[PDB]
Write an enzyme that holds these catalytic residues in place. Structure first.
Site, mmCIF file in Angstrom:
data_model
loop_
_atom_site.group_PDB
_atom_site.id
_atom_site.type_symbol
_atom_site.label_atom_id
_atom_site.label_comp_id
_atom_site.label_asym_id
_atom_site.label_seq_id
_atom_site.Cartn_x
_atom_site.Cartn_y
_atom_site.Cartn_z
ATOM 1 N N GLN A 145 55.253 28.825 -3.699
ATOM 2 C CA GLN A 145 55.030 29.487 -4.999
ATOM 3 C C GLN A 145 55.799 28.696 -6.051
ATOM 4 O OE1 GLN A 145 56.272 33.539 -2.815
ATOM 5 N NE2 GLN A 145 56.002 33.909 -5.020
ATOM 6 N N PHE A 191 54.677 36.485 -1.218
ATOM 7 C CA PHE A 191 55.490 37.707 -1.424
ATOM 8 C C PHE A 191 56.935 37.482 -1.894
ATOM 9 C CE2 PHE A 191 51.854 39.958 0.090
ATOM 10 C CZ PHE A 191 51.420 39.351 1.249
ATOM 11 N N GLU A 232 59.088 31.327 -2.777
ATOM 12 C CA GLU A 232 59.444 31.043 -4.165
ATOM 13 C C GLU A 232 60.598 30.032 -4.291
ATOM 14 O OE1 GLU A 232 61.610 32.739 -7.838
ATOM 15 O OE2 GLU A 232 60.555 34.399 -6.817
ATOM 16 N N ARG A 234 67.970 42.748 -11.863
ATOM 17 C CA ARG A 234 66.775 43.577 -11.904
ATOM 18 C C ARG A 234 67.030 44.986 -11.342
ATOM 19 N NH1 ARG A 234 61.231 43.492 -13.000
ATOM 20 N NH2 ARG A 234 61.537 41.341 -13.745
ATOM 21 N N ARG A 260 58.788 40.759 -3.058
ATOM 22 C CA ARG A 260 58.001 41.663 -3.918
ATOM 23 C C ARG A 260 58.745 42.923 -4.423
ATOM 24 N NH1 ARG A 260 51.881 43.045 -1.963
ATOM 25 N NH2 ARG A 260 50.911 43.622 -3.951
ATOM 26 N N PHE A 272 61.770 42.481 -6.059
ATOM 27 C CA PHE A 272 62.873 41.632 -6.557
ATOM 28 C C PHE A 272 64.084 42.490 -6.992
ATOM 29 C CE2 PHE A 272 64.804 38.476 -9.508
ATOM 30 C CZ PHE A 272 64.649 37.296 -8.773
ATOM 31 N N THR A 310 63.680 38.075 -15.932
ATOM 32 C CA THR A 310 64.837 38.504 -16.690
ATOM 33 C C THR A 310 65.636 37.304 -17.157
ATOM 34 O OG1 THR A 310 65.815 39.050 -14.537
ATOM 35 C CG2 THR A 310 65.061 40.893 -15.940
ATOM 36 N N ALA A 319 57.475 37.409 -10.514
ATOM 37 C CA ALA A 319 57.742 38.436 -11.537
ATOM 38 C C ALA A 319 56.514 39.167 -12.035
ATOM 39 C CB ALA A 319 58.563 37.846 -12.737
ATOM 40 N N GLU A 341 53.753 43.578 -8.271
ATOM 41 C CA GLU A 341 54.976 44.218 -7.722
ATOM 42 C C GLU A 341 55.218 45.721 -8.047
ATOM 43 O OE1 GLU A 341 57.391 41.222 -9.715
ATOM 44 O OE2 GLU A 341 58.579 41.081 -7.854
HETATM 45 N N1 LIG Z 1 47.762 39.041 -1.454
HETATM 46 C C1 LIG Z 1 48.990 38.874 -2.054
HETATM 47 N N2 LIG Z 1 49.334 39.646 -3.124
HETATM 48 C C2 LIG Z 1 50.556 39.477 -3.722
HETATM 49 C C3 LIG Z 1 51.540 38.480 -3.201
HETATM 50 C C4 LIG Z 1 51.077 37.698 -2.061
HETATM 51 O O1 LIG Z 1 51.824 36.811 -1.576
HETATM 52 N N3 LIG Z 1 49.838 37.945 -1.575
HETATM 53 N N4 LIG Z 1 52.773 38.295 -3.774
HETATM 54 C C5 LIG Z 1 53.249 39.381 -4.620
HETATM 55 C C6 LIG Z 1 54.401 39.005 -5.510
HETATM 56 S S1 LIG Z 1 55.912 38.900 -4.757
HETATM 57 C C7 LIG Z 1 54.248 38.780 -6.820
HETATM 58 S S2 LIG Z 1 55.575 38.453 -7.833
HETATM 59 C C8 LIG Z 1 52.872 38.790 -7.440
HETATM 60 C C9 LIG Z 1 52.749 37.382 -7.986
HETATM 61 O O2 LIG Z 1 51.452 37.161 -8.479
HETATM 62 P P1 LIG Z 1 51.005 37.518 -9.981
HETATM 63 O O3 LIG Z 1 52.132 37.168 -10.923
HETATM 64 O O4 LIG Z 1 49.799 36.588 -10.100
HETATM 65 O O5 LIG Z 1 50.585 38.956 -9.887
HETATM 66 O O6 LIG Z 1 51.794 38.965 -6.487
HETATM 67 C C10 LIG Z 1 52.112 39.931 -5.490
HETATM 68 N N5 LIG Z 1 50.900 40.245 -4.751
HETATM 69 O O1 LIG Z 2 61.402 34.998 -9.213
HETATM 70 C C1 LIG Z 2 62.322 34.980 -10.041
HETATM 71 C C2 LIG Z 2 63.207 33.802 -10.167
HETATM 72 O O2 LIG Z 2 62.959 32.700 -9.409
HETATM 73 C C3 LIG Z 2 64.320 33.836 -11.164
HETATM 74 C C4 LIG Z 2 65.218 32.660 -11.400
HETATM 75 C C5 LIG Z 2 66.475 32.802 -12.004
HETATM 76 C C6 LIG Z 2 67.307 31.712 -12.260
HETATM 77 C C7 LIG Z 2 66.874 30.436 -11.922
HETATM 78 O O3 LIG Z 2 67.675 29.364 -12.153
HETATM 79 C C8 LIG Z 2 65.530 30.273 -11.288
HETATM 80 O O4 LIG Z 2 65.029 29.055 -10.927
HETATM 81 C C9 LIG Z 2 64.757 31.395 -11.055
HETATM 82 O O5 LIG Z 2 64.478 34.937 -11.958
HETATM 83 C C10 LIG Z 2 63.683 36.057 -11.886
HETATM 84 C C11 LIG Z 2 63.915 37.140 -12.720
HETATM 85 C C12 LIG Z 2 63.124 38.286 -12.629
HETATM 86 O O6 LIG Z 2 63.402 39.313 -13.457
HETATM 87 C C13 LIG Z 2 62.060 38.426 -11.726
HETATM 88 C C14 LIG Z 2 61.745 37.394 -10.848
HETATM 89 O O7 LIG Z 2 60.709 37.522 -9.968
HETATM 90 C C15 LIG Z 2 62.563 36.147 -10.913
HETATM 91 O O1 MOS Z 3 58.477 37.955 -8.007
HETATM 92 MO MO1 MOS Z 3 57.343 37.984 -6.342
HETATM 93 O O2 MOS Z 3 57.501 36.340 -5.855
HETATM 94 S S1 MOS Z 3 59.105 38.763 -5.494
#
Ligand SMILES: Nc1nc2c(c(=O)[nH]1)N[C@H]1C(S)=C(S)[C@@H](COP(=O)(O)O)O[C@H]1N2
Ligand SMILES: O=c1c(O)c(-c2ccc(O)c(O)c2)oc2cc(O)cc(O)c12
Ligand code: MOS
Ligand SMILES: Cc1cc2nc3c(=O)[nH]c(=O)nc-3n(C[C@H](O)[C@H](O)[C@H](O)COP(=O)(O)OP(=O)(O)OC[C@H]3O[C@@H](n4cnc5c(N)ncnc54)[C@H](O)[C@@H]3O)c2cc1C
Ligand SMILES: Nc1nc2c(c(=O)[nH]1)N[C@H]1C(S)=C(S)[C@@H](COP(=O)(O)O)O[C@H]1N2
Ligand SMILES: O=c1c(O)c(-c2ccc(O)c(O)c2)oc2cc(O)cc(O)c12
Ligand code: MOS
Ligand code: FES
Ligand code: FES
Lengths: 745, 194, 164, 756
Positions: free
Chosen positions: A197, A228, A232, A310, A342, A344, A440, A509, A691
């Protein structure tokens, strides 16, 4: 224009026919080798020796790789506090020490098993309790405070205080971590095929590792079989080791993890411990709240700080609390570094909030729906972090769910079942959620796209986001089709790549649709403006004729598009500035029947009402709601990671780790999307959906608690206003033991 | 139908075509592992890093595959897949008085949420029994019911009801080195027996 | 010294002259035959990503039997004279989808898509044995198949179309 | 700032180590197959049967492909007048009929040999004279006319008419045509790695043949081992076949041609036949010129029309001619279709021009330099197509070349050599050239770039141009570095691909530096504008600091650049509007010695002065002048293609086709770039250099002609003003035959004959 239509996922037909290509489905080069990680078996120890003698006798063994082989730098990870290959000391079971490379994955597996490491054990810190006792934390205390705490508590009719634990979760994406690395042989250039991701960090961590500029490294992501949050940042553990092998050998090299390696090495959701104290009036009105959060971060920072931030932003759920203090600390432990999953940090904090809210209701002897409703924010209200709730739709969601779930009628029938049954009990709960939309960290709220129209009029769209099943590419095609005013069949997205869209944020996010939707839209607008004269010259002509005329007049049919989310910048010093762009809202009502004698339970029915604004695609968005809800139901009711006292993970496969099955879902499962609620803040009035629904899974947990409460009222000390501790997950063990009876005693 | 030999890097596999070959092979190689479904052995080799350099696959042998309805019970060959045992028992349950199928019904309850169709179409009865996992879902039913086991070596033959003595210690059963499990008679239940 | 192993995959004869006893059918399909539709999700028989249909003439019962199996645990040395069907053996977007493939696709039963071939092969197997199954038989076919993405509801709902 | 510095080609160390990857060097997929084309052995016939029975017996045989296998369209080529695979009829000896697919390239070769074809011959047309006699042309006559020819011919003291032929040329890029095609198996997606100058057309033609949208096809080009125009369109003959094999089999497939296949199938430079008439004064001043050009286009249109237009644009070379009419016709023939070759019709028409000019000087009995100089355009003159020559530097090049080559002293020494030697003679000639810069099709004069700055401050540049050895990428990095004000070590170009810059023109017309230079420069300005606020906040910080601050402030570090050459659009109906953006000029002086008894000759000395404006890289530009000159020396002297009467190419490898060798080049070989002549019209005051110098190799041809004239004054007659025809290439055969003496005539045997 298909926006608002239930267009199926663009790749689904190929996914059903087995034609969709995932990373390890890419054919192998004739000279392609295979890598397998060699990993710590100790939680905390010095490495004394590594002996490769036996590995070298394995057919097709190529080499062992370790920290000494790295050309550039052995320091990696988001905050530069990890090693690529551990050198003198391991700090968790699963900690990467080296890798074998062989001619087949079977030979690499065999050789890796026979690598002999000698350790000297050092004392380990595994539990949150251990970390607190040793002041073993990352960084300093995080804190959000509002109002006057020593005024609220002075004023409160009653208090409830306690401690709650919530276990972690393994991502269990069906496709595990995977990287192919192709060394080009020129100038340190390498092309990488990766289930990630975060192609940006992959690219940057490989280059740092190699000692090479970032412009030499090309990362390409077609799709993931699930991410999920787990792909990432932790995908680089495999990617960097594979890049190193490609560099050393000069051959293409791949690795896909076995499930057991993946569960051990790559981290999961953060376990949370919470100590809380809530003050309230006889009415159930909350007057003060003090919560100290502790996360089990594991053996590096990774994303733990942002995950706690968060959590703190969501310790209110949908409730107005005049006087409030939340603190977070990140526990530094000898466990695999935990990461994004998912939600976070939101589901953990939201669960803590619903736990005490449920204990408030019991203490006051009031109906749970009544206490929740009476404490609910109102439109215009400020949160504990001082952000206004505009278009706060939980009241609508609540009202509609109550009505369509027939909650009050079924609550009666639950009570009848309970009075008529000894050794089975029913529970019913209705829970709200809000989930803030934006990273955030303000700087991640940026998105790029790149669009080409070719001379046949076909369109190739590229954006920084990745596909993991969530239907982002489908959504971007619907957006571009609508914006360009051409059918979707003329538009294609092939993959995500660092050479088309650079410096992309991780796909995370839940904001990807919002931000890449806007990038794609802006790029389309640029195209339309360039085509406009040609349209005017040939008004009864076709898209194809307009494109070709623009081409022949030397008008560029290529453009970028960019979006930067406005007005974000929360400060912990001033407790002000928006932390989110807007919020997504939802309500779920769930009913369960428990078996008092076995601790087993059946999910009987669930009704969800979710505000996703005006959906870009109702079928995808409902699919996202149902998927997230079932992942949440697994988190709170099924999935349990279990470690030896020495800190080694026991639960390493589907036989010891139970994610929801076909038979785990509620027998009656209803999801509706709130109607007539356009969101001015995002593309085409839509809202992020990925999420925000997951926490609604907790409705099944509180339904279970409600049923245990009835079982206890039957067989144990009868205080209606009796409280007991039920941690997450509510497994059959915990459910059964909590049904205290003539057998437990 | 004839005996096949396959030879790999670490392992020799013999597909036995007849009962005699099996018993001869097991006499020659007492330590050989008998693979049918591979749902145990494939796990021990992958995840416990065990090496079994001699494997005999008896799945082809008619005697290890025979379903036999007798006066006392229904006998299954040791190689019968769990889905075959399930189907035979579901068929007996629908046809016989309830009072004769109390054990069959117990076996069927254990088989219900026992893995999935894929595992149950290839997992053998004999495999679950001789594996002798502490958490085998079938061994407690077979023990409680005194399910009769026909054990066979080259020349010699015996039938013992399963009792507590059959599992002396961790993952061990009371069969001699040259012996195999041949069939398993699951008894009809009696009047006043539940 | 060593015998030939002969099986069929998607109607085609496979003659292995040097079968290694350790080789799984999943490894063979993916890495020798190049049929990458069948996926590795766990390697320990619990997720069904590797589900294929096996077919053979049952000497005892007389007939041809069809059943599902986890290719990740099937030794190729057990497959002499067995016929394997994979997801690519039943339909393709290049020729024509099998109804099982169409309906799971159109019913929103596939998100990331990594479990889809396994579930397809589970349903397909069911239909080869029971062309008119019941709703209960349908849920039952999938006890061995995990999906992390969809929450399962769409998959059952699209396949309910096959019942009555 | 490296602009104007002699920076080595960036890939040069890797080329010398064997580490630079060309297409066939890419590793093969485990399952990758090999294709071999099956080709016509008849100039013109009906195909009655193809028999694959013996090929099917070859170990590793996979399939035979033909027109019936194509899912989309069998109609291909730039003007859609070709087949991918011939169906009922073949129209040249190299004409592609089908292809064999096998598991090794040795097995593909074996099986292709044994594919048997049955034909029924049809009337063939091979020569220009065949085609003229049969009225076999593509399209109608092209023409540029200015002034009043009848008036001009009346005022002339002298008229000379004649006919002249220039033979064609094989590209002989050291790397032959090569494609790898990788079918993804989803959605018709295909990724191709191709040795081509034209990724856009490759992508389109493949898409067209497959019947799938263009967005499904990705074409990538790292580098070519030479292109020289032969990879501008003819590359698709191999690419499309390989794509089909990939489509049909579902495996990755590749093909690299053997030299013999490449020379036969892929076409060469257009042979030209010219019929001319010039009117001049006893002074040598030209007053009227009439030229009819005929090119041998072969069996499809391809680029032939544009090549003929460029020839008409150059029929003046550097000479002011008040009354002029040039026509061109394209001959439709049963030979492989001819194509772009460095110069693109310019060298043929410039050769024709120098030929009648050489005869004017002989007729007037005046020194050739004097006649050339007298007739030379001046600054601000209009051409025959009414373009103004602004910054006309030939006068400067001419003077400096005369001086530095010591022309006049050497002229005396050549006369003294010829006075002292009977059976060997020396010749010396000085010749100018002008070469128009732009595509003469206005819409091709467009270029894109895409630039990314990553968070470490490293920069990735992508542009529409392809590297074929000319050091385009080297120049684009030097440009980007100067524009961004960062070291070159921070910038990288990986390859050219259709998913980074779409709809690219082919890398051709010598304009790549100019047009991609500008697109890159504009992208760089965009980046500079976005970084400007950060630089202002931190004026003593680093590039890396500014980049990171911009990233953290959510300012995009990715952009396109585009350039469209302004003010272009020549009209044949009005004889008006600019055909070219500007002109590149040069002058070469060459000296030769011929062996009148054998026809062998030695290149003694060549001096060149070239106007390349303010060079971006004098080492690369000097390299281009030397390389282009030697190709022209090959065109005019060494290289000769030869066909059977039935139209079958005999010369299909280095044993029978002789390109210049180490031992071929002038013993003293001097090249200078003109100083202080900035070009306001192009990137950083530079000028295009690719193609302009190739015609200068004709200085060798005309030195040879001078030497022959001496041989003829010695042994053949006493007519000092005799005009003999000498066609190009002036091979040993042609040189020896022209030195008419006692042996050519057989007078030495006692016979009467036509010598003195
Ligand atoms: N099928 C599927 N749905 C999913 C995921 C995934 O890996 N597979 N990841 C989830 C997570 S952790 C996030 S943050 C969002 C990311 O995608 P979006 O920003 O395009 O919604 O999808 C969610 N839904
Ligand atoms: O997925 C996330 C993530 O990676 C980071 C992050 C923070 C500092 C860094 O230096 C970086 O590379 C990433 O913040 C987030 C903040 C949110 O509120 C939600 C998220 O889902 C993420
Ligand atoms: O912000 Mo989804 O990759 S936990
Ligand atoms: C995902 C999954 C889920 C499972 N769930 C359960 C469950 O819920 N409950 C439960 O009880 N089990 C469960 N199992 C285990 C399953 O029931 C057994 O693995 C199966 O019965 C073993 O049979 P097999 O034919 O596959 O054995 P194999 O792996 O082929 O052999 C197993 C052992 O039996 C021996 N053996 C086989 N036949 C004979 C013979 N006739 N004579 C002497 N020795 C013999 C072999 O030598 C070997 O030691 C599960 C397995 C999997 C993979
Ligand atoms: N080394 C090398 N130089 C070369 C060529 C080539 O293939 N190799 N092609 C020539 C031709 S035909 C042209 S049109 C120009 C094109 O490149 P430019 O536009 O970058 O000059 O390069 C010339 N110089
Ligand atoms: O190389 C050239 C070329 O490709 C074309 C061309 C013409 C028509 C088309 O449809 C097309 O695709 C290309 O014109 C040219 C004109 C020049 O003066 C010089 C050139 O070198 C080219
Ligand atoms: O214009 Mo150069 O490719 S002949
Ligand atoms: S891979 Fe999970 S069951 Fe075979
Ligand atoms: S669609 Fe992703 S695991 Fe099923």
């Amino acid at each position: 224009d298909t926006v608002g239509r239930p267009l199926p996922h663009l790749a689904a037909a190929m996914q059903a026919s087995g034609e969709a290509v995932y990373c390890d489905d890419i054919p192998r080069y004739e000279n392609e080798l295979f890598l397998r990680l060699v990993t710590s078996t100790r939680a905390h120890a010095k490495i004394k020796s590594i002996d490769v003698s036996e590995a070298q006798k394995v057919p097709g063994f190529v080499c062992f790789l370790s920290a000494d082989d790295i050309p550039g730098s052995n320091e990696t990870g988001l905050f530069n506090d990890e090693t690529v290959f551990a050198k003198d000391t391991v700090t968790c079971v699963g900690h990467i020490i080296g890798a074998v490379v062989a001619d087949t994955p079977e030979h690499a597996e065999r050789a890796a098993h026979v690598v002999k490491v000698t350790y000297e054990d050092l004392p380990a810190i595994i539990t949150i309790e251990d970390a607190i006792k040793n002041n073993s934390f990352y960084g300093s205390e995080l804190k959000i405070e509002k109002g006057d705490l020593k005024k609220g508590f002075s004023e409160a009719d009653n208090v409830v205080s306690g401690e709650l634990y919530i276990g972690g979760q393994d991502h269990f994406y069906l496709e595990t971590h995977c990287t192919i690395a192709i060394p080009k042989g020129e100038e340190g250039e390498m092309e990488l095929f990766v289930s990630t991701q975060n192609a940006m960090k992959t690219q940057s961590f490989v280059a740092k590792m190699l000692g090479v500029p970032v412009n030499r490294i090309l990362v390409r992501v077609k799709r993931m079989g699930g991410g999920f949050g787990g792909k990432e940042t932790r995908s680089t553990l495999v990617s960097v080791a594979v890049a190193l092998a490609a560099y050393k050998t000069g051959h293409p090299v791949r690795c896909m993890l076995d499930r057991n390696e993946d569960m051990l090495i790559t981290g999961g959701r953060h376990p949370f411990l919470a100590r809380y104290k809530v003050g309230f009036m006889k009415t159930g009105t909350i007057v003060a709240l003090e919560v100290d959060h502790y996360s089990n971060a594991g053996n590096s920072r990774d994303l733990s700080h942002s995950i706690m931030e968060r959590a703190l932003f969501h310790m209110d759920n949908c409730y107005k609390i005049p006087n409030i203090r939340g603190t977070g600390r990140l526990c530094k432990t000898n466990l695999s570094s935990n990461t994004a999953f998912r939600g976070f940090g939101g589901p953990q904090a939201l669960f803590i909030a619903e736990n005490w809210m449920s204990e408030v209701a019991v203490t006051c002897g009031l109906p749970a729906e009544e206490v929740r409703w009476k404490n609910m924010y109102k439109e215009g209200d400020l949160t504990h972090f001082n952000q206004r709730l505009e278009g706060f739709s939980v009241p609508r969601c609540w009202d509609e769910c109550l009505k369509s779930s027939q909650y009050y009628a079924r609550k009666s029938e639950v009570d009848k079942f309970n009075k008529e049954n000894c050794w089975k009990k029913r529970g019913l709960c209705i829970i709200p959620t809000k989930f803030g939309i934006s990273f955030t960290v303000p700087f991640l709220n940026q998105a790029g796209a790149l669009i080409h129209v070719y001379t046949d009029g076909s369109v190739l769209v590229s954006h920084g986001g990745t596909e993991m099943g969530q239907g982002l590419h489908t959504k971007m095609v619907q957006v571009a089709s609508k914006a360009l005013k051409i059918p979707i069949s003329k538009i294609y997205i092939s993959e995500t790549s660092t050479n088309t869209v650079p410096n992309s944020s991780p796909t995370a996010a839940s904001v990807s649709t919002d931000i890449y939707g806007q990038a794609v839209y802006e790029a389309c607008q640029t195209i339309l403006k360039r085509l406009e004269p040609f349209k005017k010259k040939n008004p009864d002509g076709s898209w194809e004729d307009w494109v070709m005329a623009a081409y022949q007049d030397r008008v560029s049919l290529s453009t970028t598009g960019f979006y930067r989310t406005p007005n974000l910048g929360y400060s912990f010093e001033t407790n002000s500035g928006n932390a989110f762009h807007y919020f997504t809202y939802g309500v779920a009502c769930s009913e369960v029947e428990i078996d008092c004698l076995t601790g087993d339970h059946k999910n009987l029915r669930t009704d969800i009402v979710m505000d996703v604004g005006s959906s870009l695609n109702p079928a995808i968005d409902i699919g996202q709601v149902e998927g997230a809800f079932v992942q949440g139901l697994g988190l709170f009711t099924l999935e349990e990671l279990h470690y030896s006292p020495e800190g080694s993970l026991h639960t390493r496969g589907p036989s010891t780790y139970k994610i929801p099955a076909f038979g785990s879902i509620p027998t009656e499962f209803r999801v509706s999307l709130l109607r007539d609620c356009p969101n001015k803040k995002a593309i085409y009035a839509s809202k992020a959906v990925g999420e925000p629904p997951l926490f609604l899974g907790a409705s099944v947990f509180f339904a279970i608690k409600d049923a245990i409460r009835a079982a206890r009222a039957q067989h144990t000390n009868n205080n209606t206003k009796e409280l007991f501790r039920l941690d997450s997950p509510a497994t059959p063990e915990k459910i059964r033991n909590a049904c205290v009876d003539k057998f437990t005693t | 139908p004839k005996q096949l030999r396959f030879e790999g890097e670490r392992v020799t596999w013999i597909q036995a075509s007849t009962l005699k070959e099996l018993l001869d092979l097991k006499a020659q190689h007492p330590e050989a592992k008998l693979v049918v479904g591979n749902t145990e052995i494939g796990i021990e080799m992958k995840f416990k890093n065990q090496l079994f350099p001699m494997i005999i696959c008896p799945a082809w042998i008619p005697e290890l595959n025979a379903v036999e309805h007798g006066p006392e019970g229904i006998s299954f060959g040791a190689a019968c897949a769990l889905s075959s045992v399930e189907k035979t028992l579901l068929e007996a349950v629908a046809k016989l008085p309830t009072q004769k199928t109390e054990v069959f019904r117990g076996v069927l309850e254990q088989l219900r949420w026992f893995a999935g169709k894929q595992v149950k179409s290839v997992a053998s009865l004999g495999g679950n029994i001789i594996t002798a996992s502490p958490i085998s879902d079938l061994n407690p039913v077979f023990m409680a019911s005194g399910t009769k086991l026909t054990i066979v070596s080259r020349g010699t033959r015996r039938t013992v009801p399963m009792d507590h003595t059959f599992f002396p210690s961790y993952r061990k059963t009371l069969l001699g080195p040259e012996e195999i499990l041949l069939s398993i008679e699951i008894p009809y239940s009696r009047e006043d027996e539940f | 010294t060593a015998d030939e192993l002969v099986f069929f995959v998607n109607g085609k004869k496979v003659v292995e002259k040097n079968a290694d006893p350790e080789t799984t059918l999943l490894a063979y399909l993916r890495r020798k035959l190049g049929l990458r539709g069948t996926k590795l999700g766990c390697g320990e028989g619990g997720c069904g990503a590797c589900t294929v249909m096996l077919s053979k003439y049952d000497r005892l019962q007389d007939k041809i039997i069809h059943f599902s199996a986890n290719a990740c645990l099937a030794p190729i040395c057990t497959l002499h004279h067995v016929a394997v069907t994979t997801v690519e053996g039943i339909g393709s977007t290049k020729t024509r989808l099998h109804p099982v493939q169409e309906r799971i696709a159109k019913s929103h039963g596939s998100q990331c898509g990594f479990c889809t071939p396994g579930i397809v092969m589970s349903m397909y197997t069911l239909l080869r044995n029971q062309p008119e199954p019941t709703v209960e038989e349908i849920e039952d076919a999938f006890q061995g198949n995990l999906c992390r993405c969809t929450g399962y509801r769409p998959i059952l709902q699209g396949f309910r179309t096959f019942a009555k």
